[PDB]
């Protein structure tokens, strides 16, 4: 019954933390990538190709 | 039905006039039978130096003690017998001497002001008597923890600058200042282009101008050679002063961040956010149900006895923050909560709370400008600070402009990841370490 | 002044089982907390004595256990108490969770949740436990199961081989499991204390779900002795197995060493995973089967979000009381099916029991709750 | 008033007797789960109600321990079951909801 | 024209978001460049490797 | 944690009790015991028992059909 949080203010609160929640997923993706040396995603980054010729 | 917007239009324009002195002469006429006139001088203690500090204050104590044409009693006796009220004050930037009086007594009212401001006797025997009264005033002031901590905030925030000084001075100056020290500060600072004759009530502006030209003509008949009373900007310092004393029953803390100063348009928005946080006192009715989250939490959990946000302004700088009072085991919680609120606003101000803040501020403004004295003081002071008088309507427009975004942007600009100036006094063992307070000025989520 | 109260250490002990106020009211269903404790230490205790004789190495694994049973003075009782205590640790774990739902105890979120963490860990532990003797069930038990992570999209393969140390179960896998089977019960033991920490924050729930603050009794006498008797009963049972029926709950074929070539058409995990086993294969899907297997246990952490009733215990709730037993019997069903081959009757009925399980906990009990509210005028 | 309204009443009287708290001398409201709202309403009861509620629950917890029940002629007769906590509970909920509603704008 | 450190603070250090984003973005490039320069330094001071030994055995 | 003395508020209740060394540990063990467990069993048969016989019926029929599915299988294969 999550209706307590349905209103104008909540909508404004939600929107205020949109950039944060976004940038915080950017941190996690890149973070997961860098930590597992994601072969798939990394190949695309210009430098960082320690698996080319 | 006469609307609020419309009501603001009805407030009569403040009339401004300049003499040949450079003395500005301003008034706001109303139907009242009484009034308030006085002179606002662009003189404080930020204008003083290490050695003449307390001079303005020492002058104030002498201002009503006798003039050339009216020695000793005389003044009092003229004022008292005409049933008027003579008063004065001085801050770090301003000095004022005003008279509340029957409006039909505007002619002598002004005459008396002139004399006071121009021919202040300074009889040597008086200077001696006053020396000992001010000393006493200091023993007295030492017991108002609040007065103390605000002097300490100023002392630490603006360390090494004139603004760091107090209005009354250190004891030795009071002990050491001489008549020559005084008169030289007088002539140095009581010059027309820095004075403003202000008035509010049942007068007509022309009558004021006439008087000003009659009793004030000849003050800057000598525009000074190379005396350049210019205020050097004042450094702010993220610093902290703790006057531990477990013999006091309650602690006072005052935390602030550097403010912009009198003229910056950012004030309006800061005042809104301040209104949102507001103030509190243990005699407020309505505890748990207060709109201010800080206030409501403080009331329900007994976090304090009183708190209050504030925004002090000086030229190009100011202290912006809160001051609270509480038990020795609550200093930590109060701080947490205070700070968490500051951040909430920087990053999450919602729309309605801002309306409330704006309305509060509108109420405050209009309510504050009620009666001859409060108005007169606003005229005189504003002329000094804004150069003009900002008509209610304009403030209303400034407030209306503000909404959540403006609050977050403006709050972040001054509070976010900024260095505080902390001042402590009382049983402050639990007052958090400066690093800790510093860390509380940003959020790891944001 | 009474040192039993101000000494940094005793405090804890005073708070644990001396002065702690408890409901004058609890009944036998509250004993399984001590029993689980006892289980945990006794398990740790025999388990250790086996480690002073056990090995690892695939070559000697099986040989060492028999060495213990035959050569090691008294090694047999130790070995069998360990293996039988393991089952008892499940009977109690099972009963505990049971007591919990019926009586609404799960309303203590943190405590309940730590308990779920306690469930998965002893499960994860006991699993590794039986791989050790390196018997037939041990090998494919260790194979049929572990594999499941190979159903995880994109990376399943990688993980299952990473947990293996090779391309199949061998060398790298037995030593691994032994070490993990050694460090886990200690970690569990810690978690238990945190479980118990959060429990002391509210005190115990009781048969009525009402609130006993109005009638608390000291743990001193009362629940210490009612825990002792209780533990004696747990000893009777554990000893009945060990001393009269050692292999009654044990698959006879974990005898006869391993053999990556064989696989004896039958094979099921130890009894306590049967209900789960049944669920998984009652689904024609690699992903779905394992996904459903997970939900089968991870749903406990969902229960509190579907409390719908205005009363806490089911003591006064006939409707739900019925659906509770239907759940138990239905779990007894899944256990039974899990124990049978994937053939004719057995398939469709175990397929129905699965749906029932999830539909009962996810739709039936929550509705029974609301109807009871409505009946009472609440 | 219907022949069938007595049926619904009859299903209710039926459940009541089945639910069983009345054998322990409890009243319907003596068995509500305690939550914030319920705790606040318990707080608002006047002395006598509160004291009576305490005595009841004590009497049940006591019975529950001996695993007994009250003689049949002393069970709480449905319909003589006073809904003493509903009005407070209802008022506590109303004010919470007003708050909840204020927090949205 | 402010300062490097100033401009750096505003655009990336102020918000703990960008602050953290900067370091995960900055760690990836660092691991790569530090491993290059390092190994290179390690080889340059050596040369009895199996690197320069290969040239001899491309055949079998 | 919560200690006695800070639990809750209690009004006007007297509690008489007796020393264990002054009473019997098994008052009317059988006299009052049996009747009561009958009473508690009765009070609960109907909510506990039904699901179990249901399992019971499904268990015996289930194995039955399992044998009669294969063993019984032949049956007839006549040509
Ligand atoms: C390492 C295995 C576990 C141990 C050692 C353990 C220990 C205990 C102890 C000593 C108590 C208090 C006595 C009692 O109520 O019986 C208790 C109560 C409880 N445990 Fe556990 N438990 C374990 C597994 C669980 C599980 C599987 C759950 C549920 C997922 C759980 C959730 C609870 C809850 C909610 C209570 C409160 C019972 C009540 O208040 O009536 N714990 N536990
Ligand atoms: C950290 C204390 C423990 C140690 C040192 C320990 C060590 C061992 C060793 C060396 C074996 C192989 C010998 C044998 O199979 O009899 C074993 C078997 C086993 N233990 Fe543990 N273990 C410990 C705690 C546990 C726990 C917490 C459980 C879960 C109840 C557990 C359940 C098992 C099981 C299921 C087996 C294999 C079953 C069987 O014997 O047939 N033990 N353990
Ligand atoms: C070493 C023995 C000293 C005991 C201290 C540790 C043990 C401990 O904390 O003791 C008390 C006895 C704890 N609670 C209960 O027993 C308990 C609580 C309410 C009711 C009943 N019974 C009947 O209504 C109970 O029995 C309990 O039983 O928890 C055990 C899991 C824990 O054991 C653990 O932590 C392990 C991690 C050691």
Short mmCIF file of N, CA and C in Angstrom, two decimals, chain A residues 8-10 12-13 15-17 19-21 24, chain B residues 347-352 404 408 443-446:
data_model
loop_
_atom_site.label_atom_id
_atom_site.label_comp_id
_atom_site.label_asym_id
_atom_site.label_seq_id
_atom_site.Cartn_x
_atom_site.Cartn_y
_atom_site.Cartn_z
N UNK A 8 2.75 15.52 -4.93
CA UNK A 8 3.60 16.57 -5.52
C UNK A 8 5.01 16.61 -4.90
N UNK A 9 5.09 16.65 -3.59
CA UNK A 9 6.42 16.73 -2.93
C UNK A 9 7.32 15.54 -3.28
N UNK A 10 6.76 14.34 -3.20
CA UNK A 10 7.52 13.16 -3.50
C UNK A 10 8.04 13.22 -4.93
N UNK A 12 8.75 15.87 -6.48
CA UNK A 12 9.85 16.84 -6.52
C UNK A 12 11.11 16.24 -5.88
N UNK A 13 10.94 15.49 -4.79
CA UNK A 13 12.04 14.82 -4.11
C UNK A 13 12.72 13.83 -5.05
N UNK A 15 12.67 13.80 -8.34
CA UNK A 15 13.36 14.50 -9.42
C UNK A 15 14.67 15.13 -9.00
N UNK A 16 14.73 15.62 -7.78
CA UNK A 16 15.94 16.25 -7.27
C UNK A 16 17.13 15.29 -7.23
N UNK A 17 16.86 14.03 -6.86
CA UNK A 17 17.89 12.99 -6.76
C UNK A 17 18.06 12.15 -8.04
N UNK A 19 19.79 13.20 -11.07
CA UNK A 19 21.21 13.28 -11.41
C UNK A 19 22.08 12.43 -10.47
N UNK A 20 21.86 12.51 -9.16
CA UNK A 20 22.65 11.69 -8.25
C UNK A 20 22.48 10.22 -8.57
N UNK A 21 21.25 9.72 -8.58
CA UNK A 21 21.02 8.29 -8.83
C UNK A 21 21.61 7.83 -10.16
N UNK A 24 25.41 7.76 -9.97
CA UNK A 24 25.77 6.71 -9.05
C UNK A 24 25.73 5.33 -9.72
N UNK B 347 20.48 20.26 -1.37
CA UNK B 347 20.23 19.20 -2.34
C UNK B 347 18.79 18.74 -2.54
N UNK B 348 17.85 19.08 -1.64
CA UNK B 348 16.49 18.52 -1.75
C UNK B 348 15.35 19.42 -1.41
N UNK B 349 15.54 20.73 -1.45
CA UNK B 349 14.44 21.63 -1.13
C UNK B 349 13.23 21.27 -1.97
N UNK B 350 12.10 21.02 -1.32
CA UNK B 350 10.88 20.70 -2.05
C UNK B 350 10.13 22.02 -2.26
N UNK B 351 9.13 22.00 -3.12
CA UNK B 351 8.45 23.22 -3.48
C UNK B 351 7.64 23.96 -2.41
N UNK B 352 6.77 23.24 -1.68
CA UNK B 352 5.90 23.89 -0.71
C UNK B 352 6.65 24.53 0.44
N UNK B 404 11.97 26.42 -5.19
CA UNK B 404 12.92 25.34 -4.81
C UNK B 404 14.30 25.41 -5.46
N UNK B 408 17.98 25.64 -3.64
CA UNK B 408 19.05 24.65 -3.73
C UNK B 408 20.30 25.26 -4.30
N UNK B 443 27.55 15.88 1.87
CA UNK B 443 26.98 14.56 1.96
C UNK B 443 27.66 13.64 1.00
N UNK B 444 28.04 12.46 1.49
CA UNK B 444 28.63 11.44 0.66
C UNK B 444 27.63 10.87 -0.37
N UNK B 445 26.31 11.03 -0.14
CA UNK B 445 25.32 10.57 -1.14
C UNK B 445 25.27 11.47 -2.32
N UNK B 446 25.60 12.72 -2.10
CA UNK B 446 25.48 13.70 -3.16
C UNK B 446 26.85 14.20 -3.65
#
